[PDB]
Amino acid sequence: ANEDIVVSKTSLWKEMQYNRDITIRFKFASSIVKSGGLGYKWSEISFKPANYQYTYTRDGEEVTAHTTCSVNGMNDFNFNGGSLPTDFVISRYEVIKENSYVYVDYWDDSQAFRNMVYVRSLAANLNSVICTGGDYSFALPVGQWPVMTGGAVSLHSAGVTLSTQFTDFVSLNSLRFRFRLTVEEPSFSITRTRVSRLYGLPAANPNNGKEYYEVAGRFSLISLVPS
Amino acid sequence: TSLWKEMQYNRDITIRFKFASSIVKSGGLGYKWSEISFKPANYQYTYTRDGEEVTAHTTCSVNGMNDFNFNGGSLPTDFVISRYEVIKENSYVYVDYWDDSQAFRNMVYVRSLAANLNSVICTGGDYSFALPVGQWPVMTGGAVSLHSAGVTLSTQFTDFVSLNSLRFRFRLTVEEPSFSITRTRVSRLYGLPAANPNNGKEYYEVAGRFSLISLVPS
Helix, strand or coil: EEEECCCCCCCEEEEEEEEEEEEEEEECCCEEEEEECCEEEEEEEEEEEEEEEEEEEEECCEEEEEEEEEEEECEEEEEEECCCCCEEEEEEEEECCCCEEEEEEEEEEHHHCCCCCCEEEEEECCCCCCEEEEEEEEECCCCCCCCEEEEEEEEEEEEEEEEEECCCCEEEEEEEEEEEEEEECCCEEECCCCCCCCCCCECCCCCCCCCCEEEECCCEEEEECCC | EEEEEEEEEEEEEEECCCCCCEEEEECCCCCEHHHHHHCCEEEEEEEECCCCEEEEEEEEEEECCCEEEEEEECCCCCCCCCEEEECCCCCCEEEEEEEEEEHCCCCEEEEEEEECCCCEEEECEECCCCCCCCCEEEEEEEEEEEEEEEEEEEECCCCCEEEEEEEEEEEEEEEECCCCECCCCCEEEEECCCCCCCCCCCCCCEEEEEEEEEEECC
C-alpha cells in the first residue's frame, strides 16, 4: 500500500541519557584447508566468524553476554615455494591490516539491553586491545617444518550499530561494535622461507592460545522516553 | 519535553539484488581449483511507486553456506575443486536495503516493521573449467527459492549522526533444476552453487508491501 496514517494521539516525551559499563569478550576463528597430493601444499588459511559466551558483573548483577566476531576487508597473501609436488605452498592466506575491520556483535540478557528503544544517539568509550598472532606449524611429510609466527594489530572503536530484529511477533536487539585497526609489533614471517617483516595479523593463529580478547569501557545512550 | 505521535507508513517496496562470487584456481599445472565462494554484492537502482521516484541501494550476502568439494584424483592431471560453496535449506540470504524516500527518513524511532513479499527463484548458470588438456567439465544448474523470514532495522551511530538501513532475511527452499558437474560423477545435487549464481541476470527481484510504525514530531 502507499499511505500515511495517524496511529496515536500526540504525547509527551523527553530525551534521557543512560551510561553503562560494558565488557566485550570475543575471539577469532580460522579455517585451514590443505590441497591434495603429497601434502606439502595448503590451499586456504582464512578467518571465520566465531562465537563466545560469558558472564560478568555490572552494578551488582550478573550479566550473560554473547558475542560474534567477524572481519571484513581482509587481504589475500600467498607463498609459492615452487611448482614441484615437494615444494611448500600457501595458495591464499588472509591478513587483517589497516584497510580491514573487525566487527564484534554483542547481546546481553540485562533488562537495560532489552530496553534500548528509540535510541537517538549511542557513543562508546572503549579501551583498545592488541591482538597478536601465535605460531602455526606446517607439518610437511618430509623435512623441517616451516612455521608462521608473529603479527599484531590494535583495535580501536569506530562506531556502533544498533540492530532490532522484528520476527513474527517480538523484537530482539543487538549491538555491533566496529573496530578500525592499526598494525603493531611484532611483524610476522614464515620460518624457512624468505617471507618476513610483514605487518598485520594473519589468520593462522590469531587468538595466540588466549581464551578470549577483551575490550572494556562504557557507552552512553540517549533515547526518547515519555515525559 | 517534546510532542510526538505514532504514524504508520504503508508503501510498496521493490528489492533488487544480485550475488557475487570469487573463483580461485590452484597454482601449478592448471587442473586444480582451490575455492569457489560467495562474496557480498552491491546493487543500486531506481523505481517508481505512486508518483515518487525512489533510489535504492542493496547489499546481498549469504550465511550458513555449505562447503562441497570434488576430488577427481591426486594426480597433477586430475580435475579437483578443493572447496565450493552451495546454499541449501540450512543457509540464509540477507539483503541490506536503503532508499532515499521521504518515508524512509521517518524510520528513526520505530515501534514495528512488517513486510509481505513475493518469493523469487535464483538459478545457477554454467561455469566452465578450462583444463590444460581434455574436454572441459562444466558446473551447471542448481536453484533455491527465497522466502521472507524477518526484517531487521539497523541504525549506525558514527562520530556525529545516525544512518538507518533494513536487513531482509530470506530462508531457502531447494528447487529444480539440481546442479551437476559434467564429465564427472557429481550429479543431481540440490542447492545453488557459487559458480554462477546470477545466471546472466542483471539482478533478482523481490517485491511486495512494507509497513512501518514510527514515532514522529507532532
